Structure 1
Amino acid sequence: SAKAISEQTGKELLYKFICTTSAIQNRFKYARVTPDTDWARLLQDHPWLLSQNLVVKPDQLIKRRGKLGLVGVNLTLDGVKSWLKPRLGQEATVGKATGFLKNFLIEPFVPHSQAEEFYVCIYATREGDYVLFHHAQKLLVGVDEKLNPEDIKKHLLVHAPEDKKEILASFISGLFNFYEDLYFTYLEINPLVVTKDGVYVLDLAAKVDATADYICKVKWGDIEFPPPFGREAYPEEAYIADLDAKSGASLKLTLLNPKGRIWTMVAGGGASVVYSDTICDLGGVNELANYGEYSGAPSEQQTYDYAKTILSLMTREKHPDGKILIIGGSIANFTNVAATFKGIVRAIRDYQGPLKEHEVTIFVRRGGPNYQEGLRVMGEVGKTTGIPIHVFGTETHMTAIVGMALGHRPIPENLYFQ
């Protein structure tokens, strides 16, 4: 899927790889600030921080930073430090997401008039890439079309100041070629500045198609895909992501609330979402700990490694009301339910101690190849460990176990194993 990158990552790639007749100014003149920043060492690396006034802003996948008052403009370095003191490390809510402001970017202030400010955006659709320009003009570039400077002048630069058409057209042509060569799906510059001295990229947001790593890794290098603002990145998520990378099968894990008492381990991209929907319809959104799925016939070892991650994560801190695990799915097409449930069952064995300390109750519903044996080993692991496990098959509606696990409906023992 498409994943946003930081402004800093995008600018590094842009400054390294863009080919334009234009003279782009302030190349690589940015500095990253975190709560761990050593300011003397920062200044040693970036002496230009003293050479003119500055702009400071977060670089954390926050959009509309200007309209949020999150851009400090035309500040001395002392001004930036003062601007950062009540912001660096603070909670911030943006829209409805809440996270900590922890990563900031400092860049030179470029004095310019409003008539030297331009807007450029490229974004992918089914029918090709739309290029937007504003000083609004928009052009669909079809899948096999080039975007030459003369096409830009013709279709987009009708209203641009005459003395800036050549440099704008050259920049936007190079920008579009960079967009394609590095597998971007979204690239916005708000604003692009053009003064007598050349072109300045004051702002950038972008997404790249992360599935193109095997094509682009040489150019992308060790590219970072931060979590969206409002979530943290966890190492368990990166472990599963690395497993996912190693196989045709799909393994996905996203932590929503690590202290939540409702955990899922559901097969299928579709079913995982339906189970998650049902949990939230029944009032459990604040206790849902995770979204994820496995699918595409993973091996027993893959499922074990996935499962042991989950089981580790739900036995970190106790919760007064105990915890529930929802092991669900559709009637699978070809995922081997016995091989995969054996992997889960082996993880449950290794964690039976913690799982009993944390008062875990497990609900199972699954059909598919060899599902009857998968359901049996689940039943057997419950009896042999003491862990309550309620096991259902094809004759139970897929999501009924959610209502059971949250107390909205009684457990129908007359349906076990069917």
Structure 2
Amino acid sequence: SAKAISEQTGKELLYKFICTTSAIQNRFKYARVTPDTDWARLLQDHPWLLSQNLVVKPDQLIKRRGKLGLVGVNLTLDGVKSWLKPRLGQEATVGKATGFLKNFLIEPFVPHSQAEEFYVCIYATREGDYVLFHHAQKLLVGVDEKLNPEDIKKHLLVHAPEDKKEILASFISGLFNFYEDLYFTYLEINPLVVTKDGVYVLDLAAKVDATADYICKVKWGDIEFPPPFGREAYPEEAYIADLDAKSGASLKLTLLNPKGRIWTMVAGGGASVVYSDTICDLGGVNELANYGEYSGAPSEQQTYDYAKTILSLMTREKHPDGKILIIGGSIANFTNVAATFKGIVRAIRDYQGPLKEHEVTIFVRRGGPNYQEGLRVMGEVGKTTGIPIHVFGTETHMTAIVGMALGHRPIPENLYFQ
């Protein structure tokens, strides 16, 4: 999938890899600040922070920072530190997401006029990449088409100041080659500034196609994909992500609410979303802990390692009303249900102690290859461990176990194992 990168990451790549005749200024002149920053050390590494005034803004995938009061413009270093005091490390709500302001970029202030500000954006669609320019012109660049400076002058720069067309065209042609070479899917510079001294990339927002790592990793390096603002990143997510990378099997985990009492471990992209849909249609969105799925015929050991991560995460703190684990799925096409459920059963066994302490109740529904033995060993571990487990097969509507687990409907023992 296409993943956002920080402004800092995107500018680093652009400064390193763009090829343009245009004189790009302030290359690599940025400094990153967090609540843990050693400001003496920062100033050792970035002495230019004293050379001219500054701009400071969070770099956490927050849009429209200027409209939110979150860009400090034309400040001395002392003015930056004062501007950060009420913000750095504070909770903030942007739109409907809430998180901590904890990652800021400082850059040189660039004096310029309104007429020296430009907008450029490139974004991917099925039919090609659209290139947008505004001082609004937009050009579809087809899948096999080149974008040369003369093309940009003819189709995009008709309204641009005459003295800036050559440098704008060279930059945008370079930008587009960079966008393609590094497998971007979205790249916006708002504003791009061009003065008598050259080109300045004042702002940058971007997404890369993360599946292109096997092609791009020499240029990308150890690229980071930050979570959206309002979510944290967790080591378990990184652990699952590492599993997902090592096999053709798909293993995904996104923590929504680590303290929620409703956990899922569903097979399949589609079904995992339908279960989540059904949980929220039934009131449990504030108690839904996670979204994720496993699919693509993982082994018993991959499914054990996946499941033990979940069971660990849902036995971190108790809940007055205990917890629910939804082990669900469609009728699989090829996943060995017995082999995967044996992985899960072994995880359940290893964690049976903590699982009882947190009053976890388990609901299971699944079809596919070998599923009858899959459902049996689930029923079996329930009796061995004392954990309550209610086990259903193809004869149960896929999502019925959600209503069961939230009390909207009763448990039909007449369908167990069917």
Partner of 1:339: 339
1:255-293 superposed Cα distances (whole Å, 9 cap, x missing partner): 000000000000000000000000000000000000000
* Structure-2 separation of matches of 1:266 and 1:400: 14
1:169-228 superposed Cα distances (whole Å, 9 cap, x missing partner): 000000000000000000000000000000000000000000000000000000000100
1:344-370 superposed Cα distances (whole Å, 9 cap, x missing partner): 000000000000000000000000000
* Structure-2 separation of matches of 1:254 and 1:237: 6
Partner of 1:196: 196
* Structure-2 separation of matches of 1:304 and 1:44: 48
CA drift of 1:76 comes to: 0.6
* Structure-2 separation of matches of 1:188 and 1:195: 19
* Structure-1 separation of matches of 2:64 and 2:132: 17
Q: Structure 1 regions of 5+ residues with no counterpart?
A: none
CA drift of 1:111 comes to: 0.3
Partner of 1:99: 99
Question: 3-state DSSP class of the match of 1:297?
Answer: coil
* Structure-1 separation of matches of 2:295 and 2:106: 43
CA drift of 1:66 comes to: 1.2
1:227-270 superposed Cα distances (whole Å, 9 cap, x missing partner): 00000000000000000000111000000000000000000000
Question: 3-state DSSP class of the match of 1:288?
Answer: coil
CA drift of 1:39 comes to: 0.6
Partner of 2:280: 280
Aligned length: 418
1:361-409 superposed Cα distances (whole Å, 9 cap, x missing partner): 0000000000000000000000000000000000000000000000000
> Which runs of structure 2 are paired with 1:7-406 in the superposition (5 Å)?
7-406=7-406
The two structures have a TM-score, normalised by structure 2, of: 1.00
Q: Structure 2 regions of 5+ residues with no counterpart?
A: none
* Structure-1 separation of matches of 2:18 and 2:49: 25
* Structure-2 separation of matches of 1:354 and 1:287: 20
CA drift of 1:139 comes to: 0.4
* Structure-2 separation of matches of 1:95 and 1:44: 37
The two structures have a TM-score, normalised by structure 1, of: 1.00
* Structure-2 separation of matches of 1:197 and 1:67: 28
* Structure-1 separation of matches of 2:92 and 2:137: 35
Q: CA RMSD in A?
A: 0.4
4+ residue runs over 2 A deviation: none
Identity of aligned residues (%): 100
1:18-69 superposed Cα distances (whole Å, 9 cap, x missing partner): 0000110000000000000011110110111010100000000001111111
* Structure-1 separation of matches of 2:76 and 2:191: 21
Question: 3-state DSSP class of the match of 2:224?
Answer: coil
* Structure-2 separation of matches of 1:40 and 1:134: 41
* Structure-1 separation of matches of 2:293 and 2:96: 25
* Structure-1 separation of matches of 2:138 and 2:55: 29
1:129-165 superposed Cα distances (whole Å, 9 cap, x missing partner): 0000001000000000000000000000000000000
Question: 3-state DSSP class of the match of 1:373?
Answer: helix
Question: 3-state DSSP class of the match of 2:285?
Answer: coil
1:289-330 superposed Cα distances (whole Å, 9 cap, x missing partner): 000000010000000000000000000000000000000000
* Structure-2 separation of matches of 1:142 and 1:97: 37
Question: 3-state DSSP class of the match of 1:285?
Answer: helix
Question: 3-state DSSP class of the match of 2:263?
Answer: strand
Question: 3-state DSSP class of the match of 2:286?
Answer: coil
CA drift of 1:7 comes to: 0.3
Question: 3-state DSSP class of the match of 2:190?
Answer: strand
* Structure-1 separation of matches of 2:50 and 2:367: 66
* Structure-2 separation of matches of 1:137 and 1:116: 17
* Structure-1 separation of matches of 2:49 and 2:150: 38
* Structure-2 separation of matches of 1:68 and 1:154: 37
Question: 3-state DSSP class of the match of 2:284?
Answer: coil
* Structure-2 separation of matches of 1:119 and 1:68: 20
* Structure-2 separation of matches of 1:312 and 1:51: 51
* Structure-1 separation of matches of 2:216 and 2:402: 42
Question: 3-state DSSP class of the match of 2:267?
Answer: coil
* Structure-1 separation of matches of 2:360 and 2:255: 18
1:96-155 superposed Cα distances (whole Å, 9 cap, x missing partner): 111100000000000000000000000000000000000100000000000000000000
Question: 3-state DSSP class of the match of 1:347?
Answer: helix
